[PDB]
Structure 1
Amino acid sequence: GPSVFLFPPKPKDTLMISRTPEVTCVVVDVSHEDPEVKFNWYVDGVEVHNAKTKPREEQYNSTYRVVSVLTVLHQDWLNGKEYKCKVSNKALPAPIEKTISKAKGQPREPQVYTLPPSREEMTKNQVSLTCLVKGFYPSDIAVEWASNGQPENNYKTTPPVLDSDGSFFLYSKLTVDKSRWQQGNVFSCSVMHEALHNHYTQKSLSLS
């Protein structure tokens, strides 16, 4: 029978004014025989009709997937309102109801520290610019890098890790050619979190 999965918005989208956050609802293993899938969306038990259902997508022979995407208001999400997705189908005994809301708990402001390469790494053609973000709660966060106003894109960020004080921390690691580091270019580590002013801070990192 059909299953339902309800995914929350990307944390950057909830926190940034330039972006529009979305709750997404996926129905998998839909039969070819009874294909009509009706979605109903609720925000604190209040029906909303502004959702946008994408058409079916054959996964394998005679089995489809159906996604519905509800745009959310930044404030509603951040105030921890419940988003309920209700799915109906002929091959269901009763409709399926899945709910998600934002992680509750006293927010704690992230502390952002940029760390330069190790002397030992400077023997290599590419060096590692590091950004430490610690002491934040909840674990919803987004980290990006930049340089001269342009996005730097060759980076990887660790998942949040629970620290011993109940808060979270992570590391992001931008990799750059040593040449660019030594020439004295400035790099920026952008952190986005609900407990920051305007959900945003930037720390810089250049050669001393």
Structure 2
Amino acid sequence: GPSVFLFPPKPKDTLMISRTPEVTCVVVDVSHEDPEVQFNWYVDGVEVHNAKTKPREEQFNSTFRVVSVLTVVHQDWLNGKEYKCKVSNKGLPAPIEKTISKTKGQPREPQVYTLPPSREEMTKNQVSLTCLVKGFYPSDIAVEWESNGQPENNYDTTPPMLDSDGSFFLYSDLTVDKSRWQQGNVFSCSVMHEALHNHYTQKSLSL
């Protein structure tokens, strides 16, 4: 019958005041015969009631997927509270329960380095601006590129990857018209992470 997956909030959403983090409870394999799904949510054992239920999503294997979204308080999540989704459905012998909470372990501060494009790339029309973020723990992090206080269009950040020492690193690749780089514009890598002062730092790069 149905199965349940419980997902943590987006890293950026738990670190920034402008964002509202969410805990997401997904029920798959809901059969067309028993479509009513019931959610009960608990923060550290105490039932809460601010959850919302998305439009049901039909799937191509002839099943529904039903999703309940629970907004959480930033500091609750960062302090280690446990979030419990309990799912009831007539297609289940017993209700299913899943619990999620912040990843544990000694936090460690990202080191952020910006690297200009290789000289050998200078023959091309577009060049690559590189942000190396290493040494951090846990792996939840967010990395962006901006110029003149506005976010950039053409950049990609690799998923974090485990390093030798049990910390994580990643790279972010910003693709930029060589003209923009040559005029002298300043470009900025912004890193958001729970172990930074104010959850935020920024490093800049120009010619």
Under a length normalisation based on structure 1, what TM-score does the superposition of the two structures give? 0.97
What is the distance in 2 between the residues matched to 1:184 and 1:121? 17
Q: Distance in 1 between matches of 2:158 and 2:60?
A: 34
Render the CA deviation track for 1:59-104: whole Å, top value 9, x for unaligned.
2375211110000000010011111110001110100111111110
Over residues 146-205 of structure 1, what are the superposed CA-to-partner deviations in whole Å (9 max), with x where a residue is unaligned?
001111121111111222222111110101010100010000000000000110000000
1:181 aligned onto 2:185: no
In 1, the alpha carbon distance for the partners of 2:130 and 2:21 equals: 28
Unpaired segments ≥5 residues, structure 1 = none
Aligned equivalents of 1:162 and 1:173: distance in 2? Answer: 19
Unpaired runs of at least 5, structure 2 = none
CA distance in 1, matches of 2:167, 2:63: 43
Counting aligned pairs with the same residue, the percent is 95
Runs of 4+ displaced beyond 2 Å: 60-63
Single out whichever of 28-37 and 192-201 deviates more from structure 2: 28-37
Question: Shift of residue 45 of structure 1?
Answer: 1.3
Residues 93 and 169 (structure 1 numbering): CA distance in 2 closer, same or farther, change over 3 Å? same
Which has the larger displacement, 32-41 or 187-196?
32-41
Q: Which whole-Å CA distance do the structure 2 matches of 1:91 and 1:38 have between them?
A: 12
Scaled by the length of structure 2, what TM-score is found? 0.97
Distance 1:164 1:29 in 2: 40
Distance 1:114 1:58 in 2: 44
Structure 1 residue 136, shift from structure 2 partner: 0.7
